Scaffold this active site. Structure first.
Site, short mmCIF file in Angstrom:
data_model
loop_
_atom_site.label_atom_id
_atom_site.label_comp_id
_atom_site.label_asym_id
_atom_site.label_seq_id
_atom_site.Cartn_x
_atom_site.Cartn_y
_atom_site.Cartn_z
N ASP A 28 34.33 -25.33 -0.64
CA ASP A 28 33.76 -25.64 -1.95
C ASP A 28 34.81 -25.66 -3.05
O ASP A 28 34.69 -26.45 -4.00
CB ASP A 28 32.67 -24.64 -2.31
CG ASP A 28 31.50 -24.67 -1.35
OD1 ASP A 28 31.54 -23.94 -0.33
OD2 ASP A 28 30.54 -25.43 -1.61
N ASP A 42 23.98 -26.36 5.57
CA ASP A 42 24.23 -27.71 5.08
C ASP A 42 23.03 -28.60 5.38
O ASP A 42 22.57 -28.66 6.52
CB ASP A 42 25.49 -28.29 5.72
CG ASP A 42 25.87 -29.64 5.15
OD1 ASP A 42 25.18 -30.64 5.46
OD2 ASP A 42 26.86 -29.71 4.39
N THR A 47 24.07 -34.18 -0.27
CA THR A 47 23.04 -35.05 0.28
C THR A 47 21.65 -34.44 0.16
O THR A 47 20.66 -35.18 0.16
CB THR A 47 23.33 -35.37 1.75
OG1 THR A 47 23.00 -34.24 2.56
CG2 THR A 47 24.79 -35.76 1.95
N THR A 48 21.56 -33.11 0.06
CA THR A 48 20.26 -32.48 -0.14
C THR A 48 19.66 -32.86 -1.49
O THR A 48 18.46 -33.13 -1.57
CB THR A 48 20.40 -30.96 -0.05
OG1 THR A 48 21.12 -30.62 1.14
CG2 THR A 48 19.04 -30.29 -0.03
#
Lengths: 512, 507, 516
Positions: B374, B44, B77-78
């Site tokens: 997910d 993450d 957020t990546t």
């Protein structure tokens, strides 16, 4: 802070793991070269155990630290082939280093190894052979594990320990259930005796003796009173620290003894209790009164050891003499004492006289290090019987199946049109390094010894043969009855590949 | 002026380089060790930047934007990080060529709103399309997340468990409410589903043949008292010389444990739970009065019970009363794999649940632990927003053609800047090609040409090295969250290009 | 191991020395391969893709790497094509042998295992290949022109290709004679004209002239080769001419003609009516006085002929060299039905002497042209096409191009190693993995991924045949048999024979010492 990216980061991690690979590449198999380990206290130990190497290998490189966690679950999962997973885990990265130069991403190699691992697991189930199919007996079960204990110092009594291991596993678990629980077997030790003096008690055992030598050596009654204080003038549990005030109070304590030695001893018969297991020992006046009524007891029993007696006997602790009753009494079939001739042991052997779910293997021996080798050889032997009951189907060990898994993988490579085929070919040549190392540890040519067996499994006959590692007559270890478990042969190629995928998915390590 | 900005361009790229290989479900892992030597490995992106603690000033700008993307969304957020860095990368040769930095802020502010107009115009509402029950649609979008895994053979079984976990909850959905347990042993199809709160229940002490496991409306007591006899919390030992005093001393040791136990019966607790262990001596008092006793409960499981039963966790026993005692409808014990499991089903505040996996290995439950987080969010965001777009970097390829074709009609300095904003959006699918081991050359060159031929939902197929219509494959992502990310990345880059000189107080 | 004496460390220096030569030319493989720069110390820079000129301009010094230079020179005479592929095979084998030496295997054991792999390898290519009709000139025409279409001169390939087939067919019998010599094929070129004019002369054509001889035409000529120079007396030792007066000066001018005419009359007795003089610049090969006496005896003057052309003329009419006039006889003469100079606009001053009528199988293709590269590059296409026609005479079999047979070699040899014992398994498996670099190199040169092209082609061969290969024309995997891009079998056989034996030779080197 550290920073490294690209291919040089992958290759630095390969060499970080290969350092531990070549370290444990020599202690593989029965001819594995021992390793001298220096403990922090200055002690020096020598052994060829795979689980003991990684436990003491204090390598600061983070890539080497991942292999230490690999050995945590592997002990209870496999136990025996601890050295075989690292040579395979290391050999995969050695060949993978050739794949990275070819321009392949590490994750595609992580996918190809998982693809080839399934070709290996399915091939192992084909060449397996049942042993205890619908037969409840211990004749073939003791002999199979009798050969596995040859690579330790219990070779002088490897036949005695093989019977104790089978009698204990058959006790806590049933063959019909195919669910062998290893937590129901406790391993203790004591300096003294020999390997043949190892006893198996279906219950609980402690290194404690009765409060008087003339007590009944056999207690057939199911009356075990677990108390926190002895049936006498009580004393505290941690430290007595006696201190008399004056002579007037000194003569009064003697009157307290005459009332308490008469009050507590007669109270044992009113509740029907016979065996009074207590924390602290008894006085000489207490033992003289119990001999009149035939009421055994134990002296100076530990705290946490008393808790274990209530688990096997199902009884309760009676912390005070006011609530003495029959409900808090223990249950057992026979509690006896075993004195090993002149060695004054006089142990407390509690038994249930039936097929209980709790056994205790008390190992003996005239040296502490010899018993230390019997513990791991016994614990590794439990994994042999655990998988046999859970999977009677087994394959030939000693490097026989590793070559068979290499052919089925190489045979399946031509029917896999994808970039992972190079990983299948590399996974095939990597499986050959486990037996190739045994040829080197045996002092033979690693190349001449490896290919002669591969031609035998193709040209001579289709069944698989093993390598003559112990300098026995010839190949075909099936004749030698050197057979390991099938769950271990599958788990060896599983945790080894699962550790490689964990390393190939890492490209940078940072720490402040 | 100029060079201080170039120092900030590269100072932010190393932060993007720290999480560049984490984009997508099949991303790479890292190994960040703290000062105590503890090992933390996670793919993450938000968790990487939380422990790095980069002291660089221009780097903390993107850290504050990523934390806002995590607080609101909790995922993706990546994509805000790599995009914010690529806007600085493509404009790097233009900064040194003499173009002002403030002109770039007008370009990103121009292209950002142009993307929201195109996203809302292209997103498709999906409520009851194709005449299909939503249970099947939520199962179709969920099963695609589980394919190409160790549980690919029995994915239909696990695909049905997720739709049951969400429908059992109220309109308010939360990913943390649904707990997942890991239990080794058994096959994959033997995984059970508990609608209530459950724990491992490692209590193996006495109390057999009593303590009925059925209750109508039991009062669940949440204590933190160690009822063991030789406990480290309760004890009594007075060192004196008198013999008659010792009988009262052993009686005082049993009264400390027993006097506190009478408060448990007088308070009305029917199912007494305690974090610390309970000895075999105390379990019998519960067994004599027909009371259920089960300790060794973790503290985390009780927090899910406190939200489920509606009570409160008390440390002291004297404060036990009707104020903290919760209630439930169905309290029963099962035998999943032979091990005991107590659970309360049908509580008034049953907002949480439990899900126990099964399998013959510890690692097969690890990959299953990741995939379920997910699949839940897809069901969480599908009902939340029926207007969604194609996943797998598909929405990023639409803007590359629209904003580029729009930049070809915008004269002035905004052309190459909004035009460079198009090429900057290609970083998302390019990483999915590399983070999955695929060839990014063949995919992006074949993918970008598909849109001009008529493609509108084609994206990067993470399973096979080819292009695929992710919308038809039920690989969907929210349209508004994609807008919230592009607005977050544009605000992230515009703050960096707005800076031209660093000022530091000498200390 | 301790291993004080380190002869194995000497072998790695021999590997890394030869490894650098192959890695340098590795990227210039195939038509789509990269080009390389060659700068001279004087500053002359040239860029080309010819695999043979790259190695010759390296000036190698290490002995292990010096063997690869002669390895390429060996492929030129035997096969004549695919020279770039020979050094990658040899260079890649040593890279694989390094992995074997790290396992503790002796070089000789590796050398014997490669011989069993080479012998098994030739059969894998022989049975899978496509036999062809060697007597069928149509099959030799199609395979020869298709190879030139990917070369530099592709527009004239349709015209020069049949010139090589009829020339080989004229001197080599159809499917009867297996020995083929390219030295019996002279290609003369002059300024003016085009490549479209090709004259296949059965006799000999020289680039010389007949002047100052006033004859220029000899009927029923007996050509005799004499290496001795006919000029004035030239004695190396100290000498002096006796000149007493102006009359004695005239005596020497007349007696000098007596020394010449006595030797000219010695030659006419044997009926020799045409002479040939070897090229020699060290001294007077022929004086001005001899040009006139030969016109009285009606003999044509022919000189300035290099030694490389005398071997072509020796097999054309059966001539022999005569190093001295006293040893001249009628036995070392030739035969010619007609001899004269045919000076055309574009053909140039060429001595057309036809009518051999003697034991010999020789031809001559006269290629005209205006520019230098027009006539020069067209000559290379003849030699490049002649070699493929020569390669098919020895090996009447065709195979696919684009590295197709190399994958079939590595696929079946992997299974062949499974049926072996001793240290031959890893050596054969290492011999196959070393062959995967040629397709991966062509895959990289074609812009594709190096490993994805060869990995999928192995399964296409396991499920099908070697028909699937790498297509450089369209740039991708395609059925090359449909593309009609073929190559002879002898190129692959010699490329695997000469390369493997050179590897075994270097493996037989433990130490080298310089003598004096």
């Amino acid at each position: 802070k550290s920073r490294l990216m690209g291919l040089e980061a992958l290759k630095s991690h390969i060499m970080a793991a290969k350092a531990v690979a070549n370290t444990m590449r020599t202690s593989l198999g029965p001819n594995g070269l021992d390793k001298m380990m220096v403990d922090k206290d200055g002690d020096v130990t020598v052994t060829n155990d795979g689980a003991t190497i990684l436990s003491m290998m204090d390598v600061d490189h983070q890539i080497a630290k991942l292999m230490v966690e690999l050995s945590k679950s592997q002990d209870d999962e496999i136990g025996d082939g601890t050295t075989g997973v690292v040579v395979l885990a290391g050999a995969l990265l050695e060949e993978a280093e050739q794949l990275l130069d070819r321009g392949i991403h590490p994750i595609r190699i992580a996918d190809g190894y998982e693809q080839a691992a399934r070709v290996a697991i399915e091939h192992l189930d084909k060449i397996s052979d049942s042993v205890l199919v619908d037969i409840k007996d211990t004749e073939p079960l003791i002999q199979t594990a009798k050969t596995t204990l040859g690579s330790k110092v219990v070779n002088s009594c490897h036949r005695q320990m093989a019977e104790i291991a089978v009698n204990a596993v058959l006790t806590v678990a049933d063959m019909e259930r195919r669910d062998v629980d290893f937590e129901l077997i406790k391993v203790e030790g004591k300096v003294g005796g020999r390997l043949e003096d190892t006893k198996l008690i279906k219950g609980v055992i402690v290194d404690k003796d009765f409060s008087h030598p003339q007590m009944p050596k056999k207690v057939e009654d199911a009356k075990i009173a677990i108390l926190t204080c002895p049936f006498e003038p009580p004393k505290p549990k941690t430290k007595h620290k006696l201190d008399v005030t004056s002579v007037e109070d000194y003569k009064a304590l003697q009157k307290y003894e005459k009332e308490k030695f008469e009050e507590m001893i007669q109270q044992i018969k009113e509740t029907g209790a016979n065996l009074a297991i207590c924390q602290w020992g008894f006085d000489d006046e207490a033992n003289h009164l119990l001999l009149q009524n035939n009421l055994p007891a134990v002296r100076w029993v530990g705290g946490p050891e008393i808790e274990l007696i209530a688990i096997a006997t199902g009884g309760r602790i009676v912390p005070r003499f006011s609530e003495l009753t029959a409900e808090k009494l223990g249950f057992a079939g026979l509690v006896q004492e075993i004195s090993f001739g002149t060695t004054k042991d006089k142990m407390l052997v509690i038994e249930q006289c039936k097929n209980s779910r709790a056994v205790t293997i008390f190992i003996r021996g005239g040296n502490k290090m010899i018993i230390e080798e019997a513990k791991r050889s016994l614990h590794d032997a439990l994994c042999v019987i655990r998988n046999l009951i859970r999977d009677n189907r087994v394959v030939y060990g000693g490097g026989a199946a590793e070559i068979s898994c290499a052919l089925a993988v190489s045979q399946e490579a031509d029917k896999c049109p994808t970039l992972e085929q190079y990983a299948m070919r590399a996974f095939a040549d990597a499986l050959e390094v486990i037996p190739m190392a045994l040829s080197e540890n045996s002092g033979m040519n690693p190349i001449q010894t490896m290919t002669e067996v591969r031609a035998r499994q193709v040209k001579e006959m289709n069944p698989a043969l093993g390598i003559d590692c112990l300098h026995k007559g010839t190949n075909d270890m099936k004749q030698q009855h050197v057979i390991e478990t099938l769950i271990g042969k599958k788990q060896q190629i599983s945790l080894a590949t699962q550790m490689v995928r964990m390393i190939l998915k890492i490209d940078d390590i940072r720490k402040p | 002026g100029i060079p201080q900005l170039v120092s900030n361009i590269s100072a932010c790229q190393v932060i993007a380089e720290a999480v560049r290989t984490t984009l997508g479900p099949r991303g790479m892992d890292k190994l960040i060790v703290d000062g105590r030597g503890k090992a933390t490995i996670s793919n993450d992106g938000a968790t990487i930047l939380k422990l790095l603690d980069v002291v660089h000033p221009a780097a903390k700008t993107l850290v504050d934007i990523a934390k806002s993307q995590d607080a609101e969304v909790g995922d993706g957020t990546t994509s805000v990080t790599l995009l914010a860095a690529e806007f600085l990368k493509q404009v790097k040769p233009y900064v040194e060529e003499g173009l002002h930095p403030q002109i770039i802020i007008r370009a990103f502010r121009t292209a950002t709103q142009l993307a929201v107009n195109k996203i809302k115009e292209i997103a498709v509402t999906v409520k009851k399309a194709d005449k299909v029950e939503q249970r099947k649609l939520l199962e179709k979008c969920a099963m695609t997340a589980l394919s190409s895994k160790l549980i690919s053979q029995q994915k239909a079984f696990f695909a049905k468990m997720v739709v049951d976990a969400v429908m059992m909850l109220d309109d308010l959905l939360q990913l943390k409410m649904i707990g997942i347990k890991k239990v080794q042993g058994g096959a994959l199809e033997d995984s059970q589903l508990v609608a209530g709160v459950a724990f491992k229940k490692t209590f193996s002490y006495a109390g057999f043949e009593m303590q009925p496991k059925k209750y109508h409306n039991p009062k669940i007591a949440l204590l933190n008292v160690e009822l063991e006899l030789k406990a480290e919390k309760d004890n009594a030992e007075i060192r004196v010389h008198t013999v008659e005093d010792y009988q009262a001393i052993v009686d005082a040791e049993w009264n400390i444990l027993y006097d506190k136990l009478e408060k448990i019966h007088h308070s009305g607790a029917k199912v007494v739970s305690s974090k610390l262990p309970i000895g075999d001596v105390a379990t019998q008092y519960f067994a004599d009065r027909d009371m259920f006793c089960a300790g060794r409960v973790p503290e985390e499981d009780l927090k899910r019970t406190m939200m489920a039963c509606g009570g409160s966790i008390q440390t002291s026993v004297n404060a036990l009363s009707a104020d903290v005692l919760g209630r439930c409808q169905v309290f029963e014990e099962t035998q999943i794999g032979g091990e005991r499991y107590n659970f309360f089903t049908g509580c008034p505040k049953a907002k949480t649940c439990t899900f126990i996996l099964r399998g013959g290995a510890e690692q097969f439950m690890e990959e299953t632990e990741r995939s379920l987080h997910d699949a839940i969010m897809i069901v969480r965001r599908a009902i939340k927003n029926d207007s969604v777009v194609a996943g797998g970097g598909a929405i990023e390829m639409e803007l590359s053609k629209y904003l580029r074709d729009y930049s070809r009609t915008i004269p002035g300095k905004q052309q190459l800047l909004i035009g460079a904003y198009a090429k900057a959006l290609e970083i998302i699918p390019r990483q999915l090609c590399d983070n999955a081991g695929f060839d990014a050359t063949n995919i992006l060159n074949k993918l970008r040409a598909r849109h001009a031929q008529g493609g509108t939902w084609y994206g990067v197929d993470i399973n096979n090295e080819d292009i695929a219509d992710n919308f038809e494959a039920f690989v969907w992502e929210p349209a508004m969250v994609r807008i919230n990310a592009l607005t977050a990345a544009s605000e992230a880059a515009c703050l960096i290009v707005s800076v031209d000189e660093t000022i530091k107080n000498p200390r | 191991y301790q291993d004080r004496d380190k002869p194995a460390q000497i072998r790695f220096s021999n590997i890394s020395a030869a490894k650098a030569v192959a890695d340098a030319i590795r990227t210039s493989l195939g038509p789509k391969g990269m080009d390389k720069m060659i700068q001279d110390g004087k500053g002359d820079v040239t860029i080309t893709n010819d695999g043979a000129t790259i190695l010759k301009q390296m000036q190698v010094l290490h002995p292990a790497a010096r063997m690869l230079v002669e390895l390429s020179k060996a492929q030129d005479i035997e096969a004549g094509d695919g020279t770039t592929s020979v050094v990658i095979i040899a260079g890649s084998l040593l890279d694989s042998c390094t992995k074997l030496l790290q396992k503790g295997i002796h070089p000789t054991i590796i050398s014997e295992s490669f011989q069993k792999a080479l012998e098994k390898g030739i059969e894998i290519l022989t049975d899978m290949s496509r036999p062809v009709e060697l007597s069928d000139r149509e099959t030799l025409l199609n395979s020869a022109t298709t190879s030139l279409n990917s070369k530099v001169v592709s527009q004239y390939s349709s015209l020069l290709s049949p010139m090589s087939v009829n020339a080989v067919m004229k001197v080599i019998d159809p499917a009867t004679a297996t020995s083929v010599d390219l030295r019996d094929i002279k290609i003369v070129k002059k300024l003016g004209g085009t490549i479209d004019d090709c004259e296949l002369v059965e006799g000999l054509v020289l680039t010389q002239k007949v002047s100052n001889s006033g004859i220029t035409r000899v009927e029923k000529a007996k050509i005799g080769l004499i290496q001795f120079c006919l000029s004035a007396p030239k004695t190396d030792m100290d000498n002096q001419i006796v000149v007493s007066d102006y009359a004695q000066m005239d005596r020497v001018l007349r007696e000098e003609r007596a020394y010449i005419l006595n030797l000219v009359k010695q030659i006419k007795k044997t009926g020799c009516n045409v002479l040939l003089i070897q090229k020699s610049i060290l001294r007077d090969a022929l004086s001005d006085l001899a040009l006139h006496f030969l016109n009285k005896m009606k003999i044509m003057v022919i000189k300035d002929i290099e030694r490389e052309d005398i071997e072509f003329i020796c097999k054309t009419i059966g001539t022999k060299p005569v190093a001295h006039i006293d040893q001249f006889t009628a036995d070392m003469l030739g035969s010619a039905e007609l001899a004269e100079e045919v000076n055309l606009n574009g053909s140039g001053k060429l001595l057309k002497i036809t009518g051999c009528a003697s034991p010999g199988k020789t031809v001559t293709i006269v290629v005209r042209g205006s520019n230098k590269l027009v006539i020069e590059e067209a000559e290379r296409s003849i030699h490049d096409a002649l070699c493929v026609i020569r390669c098919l005479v020895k090996k009447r079999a065709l195979i696919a191009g684009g590295g197709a047979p190399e994958i079939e070699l590595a696929l079946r040899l992997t299974e062949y190693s499974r049926t072996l014992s001793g240290m031959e398994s890893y050596c054969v498996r290492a011999f196959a993995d070393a062959m995967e670099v040629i397709p991966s190199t062509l895959a990289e040169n074609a812009g594709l991924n190096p490993i994805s092209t060869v990995t999928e082609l192995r399964n296409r061969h396991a499920q099908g045949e070697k028909t699937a290969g790498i297509n450089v024309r369209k740039g991708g995997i395609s059925n090359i048999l449909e593309e009609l891009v073929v190559q002879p079998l002898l190129v692959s056989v010699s490329a695997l024979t000469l390369a493997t034996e050179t590897v075994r030779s270097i493996l037989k080197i433990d130490d080298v010492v310089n003598t004096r």
